[PDB]
Design a protein around this ligand. Structure first.
Ligand SMILES: N[C@H]1COc2ccccc21
Lengths: 300, 237
């Protein structure tokens, strides 16, 4: 189990660590989060009490370095940093633990939620979507735009998700216009899976990462990307059976985890009705259709 | 975006544009089978592709063989239309290619957009106008060439005859849409109006009779009356 210590908490903030959230009061004696499960990426995120504008946060993997949070009063945010001096870091963490100044990642033993939301997410792929190569961790926030959003403005602060566009030459083979538009299997299997992602695991990792950035930061371009990657599979008549089964599991846990009160803004009525009730795969997403119908029957 | 009454003069500016109407591409007669089921038999159709400024009509005849062995024909017909429009654009010299293509039915937008991805500068637009281009097959010489085709064929017409020698393209289009609206609302009566007087003929190289300016005013008045009469017969007014 690993630890992200905090220098201090000078401003009142709601802190979240994956799907859990807790409040810290201004200048409360708070020095971080312990017992973080090794083996998964994690995200530590922030919403200031005095300005809920800009949820922001850091994706990290404790196996890649010792990371801590320190507030910057100039830039006005909680910043993640890496400590290269390992003995210094270990000694800092041990003192804060002895003084019981840290909250505990509250994972229930039965609970596979985080694994199931991040099964295919890998830090190395996050760091290619979020380009900032001098750090081992990646910053995301509410307002960051995607490479596709920019095409339709600062490129260094972009989310470089894979561009999916159903009415593009990439998606449509000359002479198979109707075929390829109505059945996206070529675009899914040859262009995207074989061509760009190399395998379904990388495709699912980006899909899962897009959802999590949509849910935790309200990042609109991530929500667009998540829905586009679902629709591309559902709109393909030919999809490997193992991908359909896995997609059903992935979506099920995303829908299960979504705050009920955010469904209106994080779920696209058109995409979901198409995917569940009209598309080629309308019968292949049993778990997801069942939770969607019992939890958000209004959207449908 | 969409084309409507607010930007109607745009049709007659000097930016090349084409209307595309697909309502006569897939045509069928519905009939009873010996077993008492219902079946369709396709007949020849046509794409109606019109330059509203010049009157140049590119009539692509859709021969029934293009449907042979195909499924979901009403869907296919939209994609076949888009295929043929795209082929026509590619066949034209660059300086004759349209800057905009306006489809009369919104279901043509995605098929045409997809087939024209190679032409990102050509705007594909819907329209809020209800245009009577479906009545194209009530023009005898157009109907004749379509029904006689034994193979796919493109036939070129000027749908304004020589009217642009005397009137503007705004007025020519208004005349055309009034004639076609009349033919659509009551074909028999409209054709009676157009040919009642045997002394006015259709030139071999024309589609409509050789009316003088004053006679066109009379004809135009009779077509309005017909549309109003039918409106009254329809709604009991
Ligand atoms: N509000 C509860 C729920 O999750 C956490 C995580 C850390 C401290 C406290 C809590």
């Amino acid at each position: 189990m690993n630890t992200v210590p905090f220098t201090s908490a000078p401003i009142e903030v709601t802190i979240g660590i994956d799907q859990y959230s807790f409040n810290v009061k201004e200048n409360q004696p708070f020095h971080g989060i312990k017992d973080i499960p090794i083996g998964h990426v994690h995200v530590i995120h922030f919403q200031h009490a005095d300005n809920s504008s800009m949820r922001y946060g850091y994706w990290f993997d404790c196996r890649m370095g010792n990371f801590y949070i320190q507030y910057d009063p100039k830039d006005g945010l909680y910043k993640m940093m890496e400590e290269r001096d390992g003995a210094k870091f270990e000694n800092i963490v041990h003192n804060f633990k002895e003084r019981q100044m840290m909250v505990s990642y509250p994972k229930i033993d039965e609970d596979d939620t985080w694994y199931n939301l991040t099964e295919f997410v890998q830090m190395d792929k996050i760091r290619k979507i979020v380009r900032k190569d001098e750090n081992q961790f990646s910053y995301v926030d509410s307002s960051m735009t995607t490479v596709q959003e920019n095409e339709l403005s600062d490129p260094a602060h972009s989310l470089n998700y894979t561009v999916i566009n159903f009415k593009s030459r990439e998606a449509i083979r000359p002479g198979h216009e109707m075929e390829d538009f109505l059945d996206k299997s070529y675009y899914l299997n040859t262009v995207m899976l074989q061509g760009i992602f190399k395998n379904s695991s990388n495709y699912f990792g980006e899909l899962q990462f897009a959802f999590l950035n949509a849910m935790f930061f309200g990042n609109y371009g991530s929500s667009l990307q998540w829905h586009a990657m679902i629709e591309l599979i559902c709109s393909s008549a030919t999809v490997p059976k193992h991908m359909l089964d896995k997609l059903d599991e992935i979506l099920y846990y995303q829908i299960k985890t979504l705050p009920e009160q955010y469904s209106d803004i994080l779920l696209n009525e058109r995409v979901w009705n198409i995917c569940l009730y009209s598309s080629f795969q309308k019968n292949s997403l049993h778990n997801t259709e069942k939770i969607m119908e019992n939890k958000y029957p209004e959207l449908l | 975006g969409a084309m409507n009454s607010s930007n109607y003069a745009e049709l007659f500016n000097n930016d090349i544009k084409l209307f595309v109407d697909d309502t006569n591409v897939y045509r069928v007669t519905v009939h009873k089978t010996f077993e008492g089921n219902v079946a369709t038999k396709a007949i020849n159709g046509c794409i109606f592709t019109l330059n509203p400024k010049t009157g140049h009509l590119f009539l692509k005849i859709i021969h029934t063989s293009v449907w042979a062995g195909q499924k979901r024909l009403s869907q296919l017909a939209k994609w076949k239309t888009a295929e043929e429009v795209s082929a026509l654009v590619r066949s034209l010299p660059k300086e004759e290619q349209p800057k905009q293509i306006i489809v009369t039915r919104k279901a043509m937008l995605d098929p045409l957009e997809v087939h024209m991805l190679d032409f990102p500068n050509i705007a594909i637009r819907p329209t809020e106008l209800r245009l009577p281009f479906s009545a194209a097959m009530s023009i005898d010489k157009l109907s004749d060439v379509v029904m006689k085709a034994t193979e796919p064929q493109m036939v070129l017409f000027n749908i304004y005859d020589d009217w642009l020698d005397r009137i503007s393209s705004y007025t020519a289009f208004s005349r055309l849409t009034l004639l076609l609206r009349a033919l659509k609302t009551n074909e028999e009566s409209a054709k009676m109006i157009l040919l009642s007087d045997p002394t006015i003929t259709i030139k071999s190289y024309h589609l409509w009779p050789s009316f003088t300016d004053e006679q066109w005013i009379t004809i135009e008045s009779q077509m309005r009356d017909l549309i109003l009469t039918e409106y009254g017969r329809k709604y009991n007014v």
